[PDB]
């Protein structure tokens, strides 16, 4: 809804139920919903055309090692598990299998001079590498 | 000092492992009556066969299969190793990084190469009675150290056979003290601190430590004899030029003046003492001290310590009565009861003990005497066990 104009930068004409009988009594606006759906799918494609979802997800899966058909569907368990197992079963282990922060009290108050934004992108992989943690490497009990 | 032919060693170990090892007494001396569980099984060994293939992770449950495997392989170098935190021979079962060394018998070693800073009697492979005077005197101080100011009575002493002497003491709990304590005692005994780099190796400060007092009282009974009798270290330019270069200079010419008007090496040190009586170790006060002269004496005969073998829990050392192939000589028990009667040249090699038995048990030759010390320590252990 909002995305219609943020990245895609156009209008989204929408029609609730009580106007559907009006458009039953209408050829211009009914056809208009039709061409509207046309444009809907169009913009839907333009989403991919700009964000490049297809080759992105493709390359990911390529490095991920798991079913892309189950990738788009949404998941973090897959794109971690079916990746790690690649290496872990070059190391002749046996794994289990399937079954069934800190706030800092934001000191509210307007700020006039310039303000900078520090990003800790790549913080957890960073700390994990930095301190060499791995399942085999802790007396965990 | 070395061995001359590895040809005999195969058959020599072949017979030795068979009928020349106190497997009973050894199983005992290690397991310590089995007062502790998983005590022996983790007590580790390291074995070394041809081309010196030394290998960790060696242990057997009790004496029987211990023997059987020892005779199955006949290792040519055998290190006793600390009881690590778990199963040595099955080390890689538990999660990694969880296998370490808990408790180790406290070990000491002293080398003859230690004394090589002034040692001119023989070589790095050859010896003579002169250098062995040190192997007779130094042990006295180190021994009585633990005998009078360390509250222990489980001491055992061996001479390696080529250069070093060993001390594998298994005191009541020191077997189970921290590496910190190891480093501590090491720092304690490390008095004369000198290898081949520093010259004024002993900056002995003003006030003495009564330890050093007893040290001195041992020094003035056993150093000068060897020095001015077995060496007469003031014999030519060479020796005393390795001497006078650690001294203050106000009188440093009078000593050579006495050096090269000589028919002995006594009045030299005598006038040394004399000018020291008129020298001023302390310009301030009237305490003319033996600091420099006795530093000289001691540094010329003092047990040079190792900084990494008497603290670590990884350096493993030989077994009681395990052969040193590269001398023939095997671990010789050494005692105060024997320090007054030892000679390195007469005590036997593996070749010699073999020719001894090549003539039922150790109960016939001088090996039963040699293990009298062993079984004596063991007797003390029996007394150690309540
Ligand atoms: Zn010599």
**Domain ranges in chain B?**
1-386
- Contacts (Cβ under 8 Å, ≥6 apart) of B114: B303, B304
Cα B123 to middle of ligand 1, angstroms: 8
Q: State the structure-solving technique.
A: cryo-EM
Catalytic: B109? yes
Most B CBs within 10 A among A91, A133, A135, A136, hence the mutation to make, goes to A136
Task: List strand residue ranges (DSSP E) for chain B, in order.
Answer: 43-49, 53-58, 77-84, 101-103, 106-110, 157-159, 165-169, 317-318, 332-334
Return the residue matching tokens 């290496």.
A87
Cα B112 to middle of ligand 1, angstroms: 12
Residue B128's CB: how many other CB atoms inside 10 A? 14
Cα B128 to middle of ligand 1, angstroms: 5
B residues 96-155 near A, CB within 8 Å?
96-98
Rounded-to-integer distance, Cα A135 and Cα A57, Å: 29
Rounded-to-integer distance, Cα B161 and Cα B266, Å: 34
The Cα of B94 is separated from the nearest Cα of chain A by a number of Å equal to 9
Residue B146's CB: how many other CB atoms inside 10 A? 21
Residue B222's CB: how many other CB atoms inside 10 A? 17
First to last CA, chain B: 44
Provide φ and ψ at B120, rounded to 5°: -120, 5
Q: State whether residue B45 is helix, strand or coil.
A: strand
Order of strands across the sheet with B332-334?
A: B106-110, B165-169, B157-159, B332-334
Say yes or no: domain B1-386 is CATH 3.20.190.10.
no
Burial class from Cβ neighbours inside 10 Å (0-12, 13-18, 19+) for residue A47 reads middle
Q: Is-contact B13 B324, C-beta < 8 A?
A: no
Q: Is-contact B112 B131, C-beta < 8 A?
A: yes
Angle value at C-alpha B81, between B76 and B82, nearest 5 degrees: 175
**For chains A and B, what is the number of CB pairs under 8 angstroms?**
9
Final resolution, Å:
4.6
Measuring CA to CA, how many Å separate B207 from each of B142, B149, B291, B345? 21, 19, 10, 41
Residue B94's CB: how many other CB atoms inside 10 A? 13
Parallel, antiparallel, or unpaired: how do β-strands B101-103 and B77-84 relate? antiparallel
Closest to B157 measured CA to CA, from B184, B138, B172? B138
Q: What HEC string does chain A produce?
A: CCHHHHCCCCCCCCCCHHHHHHHHCCCHHHHHHHHHHHHHHHHHHHHHHHHCHHHHHHHHHHHHCCCHHHCCCCCCCHHHHHHHHHHHCCCCCCCCCCCCCCCCCCCCCCCCCCCCCCCCCCCHHHHHHHHCCCHHHCCCC
The catalytically annotated residue of B67, B79, B109, B114 is: B109
Closest to A58 measured CA to CA, from A40, A39, A41, A79? A79
Task: Kindly identify which residue of chain A lies nearest to residue B95, measuring between CA atoms.
Answer: A136
In this structure, chain B runs to a length of 386
Cα B132 to middle of ligand 1, angstroms: 9
Q: Is-contact B326 B2, C-beta < 8 A?
A: yes
Is residue B109 annotated as involved in ligand binding? Answer: yes
Rounded-to-integer distance, Cα B199 and Cα B195, Å: 9
Measuring CA to CA, how many Å separate B360 from each of A43, B11, B229, B368, B373? 102, 18, 45, 11, 20
Closest to B192 measured CA to CA, from B296, B120, B310? B296
Q: Is-contact B320 B158, C-beta < 8 A?
A: yes
Rounded-to-integer distance, Cα B139 and Cα B109, Å: 10
Is residue B184 annotated as involved in ligand binding? Answer: no
Catalytic: B44? yes
Give long-range contacts, CB 8 A cutoff, 24+ apart: A34-43: A43/A4, A43/A8, A43/A10
Most A CBs within 10 A among B85, B95, B96, B100, hence the mutation to make, goes to B95
Rounded-to-integer distance, Cα A78 and Cα A66, Å: 7
Q: Which residues of B touch A131 (CB under 8 A)?
A: none
- Contacts (Cβ under 8 Å, ≥6 apart) of A4: A10, A11, A12, A43
């Amino acid at each position: 809804s909002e995305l219609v104009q943020q990245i895609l930068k156009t209008e989204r004409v929408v029609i609730p139920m009580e106007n559907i009988q009006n458009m039953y009594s209408e050829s211009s606006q009914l056809l208009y919903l039709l061409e509207h759906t046309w444009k809907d799918a169009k913009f839907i494609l333009q989403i991919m055309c700009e964000l490049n979802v297809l080759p992105l997800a493709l390359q990911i899966t390529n490095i991920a090692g798991n079913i892309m058909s189950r990738t788009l569907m949404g998941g973090r368990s897959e794109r971690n598990e079916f990746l790690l197992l690649h290496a872990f079963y070059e190391n002749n282990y046996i794994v289990p299998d399937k079954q069934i922060g800190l706030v800092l009290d934001p000191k509210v108050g307007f700020y006039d001079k310039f303000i900078l934004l520090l990003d800790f992108n790549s913080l957890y992989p960073s700390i994990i590498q930095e301190f060499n943690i791995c399942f085999t490497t802790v007396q965990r009990v | 000092m070395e061995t001359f032919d590895p040809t005999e060693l195969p058959e020599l170990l072949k017979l030795y492992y068979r009928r020349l090892f106190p497997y009973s007494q050894y199983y005992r001396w290690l397991n310590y009556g089995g007062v502790i569980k998983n005590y022996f099984q983790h007590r580790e060994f390291s074995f070394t066969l041809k081309d010196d293939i030394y290998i960790r992770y060696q242990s057997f449950n009790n004496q029987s299969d211990l023997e059987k495997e020892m005779q199955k392989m006949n290792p040519y170098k055998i290190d006793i190793g600390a009881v690590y935190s778990h199963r040595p021979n099955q080390h890689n079962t538990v999660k990694l990084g969880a296998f370490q060394a808990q408790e180790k018998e406290l070990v000491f070693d002293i080398d003859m190469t230690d004394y090589d800073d002034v040692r001119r009697c023989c070589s790095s492979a050859d010896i003579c009675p002169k250098c062995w005077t040190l192997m007779t005197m130094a042990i006295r101080i180190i021994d009585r150290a633990l005998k009078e100011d360390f509250g222990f009575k489980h001491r055992l002493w061996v001479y390696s056979g080529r250069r070093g002497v060993h001390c594998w003491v298994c005191d009541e709990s020191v077997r189970k003290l921290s590496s910190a304590v190891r480093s501590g005692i090491v720092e304690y005994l490390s008095l004369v601190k000198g290898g081949q780099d520093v010259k004024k190796k002993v900056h002995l400060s003003e006030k003495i430590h009564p330890f050093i007092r007893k040290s001195i009282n041992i020094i003035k009974k056993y150093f000068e004899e060897y020095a001015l009798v077995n060496q007469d270290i003031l014999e030519n330019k060479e020796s005393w030029d390795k001497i006078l270069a650690l001294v203050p200079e106000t009188i440093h010419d009078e000593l050579q003046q006495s050096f090269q008007k000589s028919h002995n090496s006594l009045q030299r040190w005598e006038h040394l003492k004399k000018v020291a009586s008129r020298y001023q170790n302390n310009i301030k006060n009237d305490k003319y001290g033996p600091w420099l002269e006795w530093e000289i004496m001691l540094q010329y005969c003092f047990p040079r310590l190792d900084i990494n073998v008497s603290k670590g829990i990884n350096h493993l050392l030989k077994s009681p009565f395990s052969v040193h192939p590269k001398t023939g000589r095997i671990s010789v028990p050494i005692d105060l009861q024997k320090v007054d009667q030892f000679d390195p040249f007469t005590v036997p090699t593996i070749s010699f003990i073999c020719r001894e038995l090549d003539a039922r048990d150790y109960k016939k030759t001088s090996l039963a005497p040699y293990v009298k010390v062993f079984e004596h320590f063991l007797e003390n252990l029996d007394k150690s066990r309540k």
